[PDB]
Amino acid sequence: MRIGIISVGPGNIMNLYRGVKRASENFEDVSIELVESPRYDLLFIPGVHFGEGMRRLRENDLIDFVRKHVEDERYVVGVCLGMQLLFEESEAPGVKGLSLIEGNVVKLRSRRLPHMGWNEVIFKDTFPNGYYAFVHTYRAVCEEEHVLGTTEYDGEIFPSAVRKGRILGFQFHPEASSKIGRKLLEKVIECSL
């Protein structure tokens, strides 16, 4: 089990490394690398502006590194900004995303922003329904086909979680979501088997 976490940013990505190392404890023969070039079974795309990071994945020849993962039925999981990058474009006016899942990113309909605090995620399947820690302004827009988890903020229901095959996206911070985030991350690992 080779786990790779793309470390190039932006944001703090080490809270995620720690959360993943934490969840991988009970698991046999497990390795976790910080990633910024070609070598994984479970690849993490973290981050906390759509422009930056989309730039940093270019400036590190990783767009293909990720493309090759998806192509090879490997697990590819976007966290926070990383999730928004799975899509075609965000409102970063003009920048193309990874276009791994069809859709775009859009400002939240709320007068109160950012969406910040613990909000409920309800999953179609597999993952633990419950409260996770959110901090974001932009949301994904996609087909119900690719909706995995749902969350309501200020009367607006959106994809707090997303899935196209073995590509996964989570809009919240599992590494800051207490017991349930750990359980969520465990289930992500358990899936890549």
């Binding site: 934490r22 910040m116 605090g117 613990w118 909000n119 820690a133 590494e175 800051a176 017991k179």
Partner: protein, 251 residues
């Protein structure tokens, strides 16, 4: 729907929790990182670390605390207490803190609120307001509640929002450490003046005080001794609040 938050306040000094802790289940009364790690395990929604280390060491000590805490806790946390410039705050956020709390420094240099907000985003800024009634009016007090600033609370709250703050930690000096209930009158007073999230602080003595604070308009309720001394169970408190129509995070 965004949950109303139960927040634990760890008062730390030199890197130790003050007046220890009843949690003999732990392996330390007053280890701030183990306590915090524990508070997450039992259902606290957020942590707030307030340092009072004699400034000789304080700057090194708080970075010590933040680095050790970020490394182990899995819920959002906040450091405050004598953060006086963008320099001190920057290095603290970069060391792993989700947010920093500014008070005296903010009142004396409001631009500081903006300074941090632009670099680290409004999400990272918490302004602590300590208020107390002086002659029928709510006045803002700096220097740990000892200096009256002449600034009306009504004004400072609106200013703090304009400045780019992301959250307000409201402590009633009149109720702090009294276990008699939060200052709901003050919460209700502030509620209309700002859309910012409000953390109620000071006066917590039991479960109902928490409900009263949320009725008053608080978005979060902060407490210390009542939690450290096993005076209120966290799961029970949340079960209780849920029962009475408050939207809490229940696992």
């Amino acid at each position: 729907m965004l949950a109303k938050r139960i927040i634990a306040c760890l008062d730390v000094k030199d890197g130790r929790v003050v007046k220890g802790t009843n949690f003999e289940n732990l392996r330390d009364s007053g280890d701030p990182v183990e306590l915090g790690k524990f508070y997450s395990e039992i259902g606290i929604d957020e942590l707030v670390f307030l340092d009072i280390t004699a400034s000789v060491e304080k700057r090194k000590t708080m970075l010590e605390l933040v680095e050790k805490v970020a490394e182990q806790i899995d819920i959002p946390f906040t450091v405050g207490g004598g953060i006086h410039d963008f320099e001190t705050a920057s290095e603290l956020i970069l060391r792993g803190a989700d947010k920093v709390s500014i008070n005296t420094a903010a009142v004396e240099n409001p631009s500081l609120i903006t300074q941090i907000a632009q670099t680290f985003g409004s999400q990272a800024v918490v302004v602590a307001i300590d208020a107390k009634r002086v002659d029928g009016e709510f006045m803002v007090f700096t220097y740990s509640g000892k200096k009256n600033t002449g600034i009306l609370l009504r004004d400072w709250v609106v200013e703090v929002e304009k400045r780019g703050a992301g959250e307000i930690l409201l402590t009633s000096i009149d109720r702090d450490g009294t276990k008699s209930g939060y200052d709901t009158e003050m919460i209700r007073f502030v509620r209309p003046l700002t859309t910012l999230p409000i953390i109620a602080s000071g006066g917590a003595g039991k479960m109902e005080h928490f409900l009263e604070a949320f009725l008053a308009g608080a978005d979060a309720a902060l407490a210390a001794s009542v939690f450290h001394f096993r005076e209120i169970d966290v799961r029970e408190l949340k079960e209780y609040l849920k029962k009475h129509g408050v939207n809490v995070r229940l696992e």
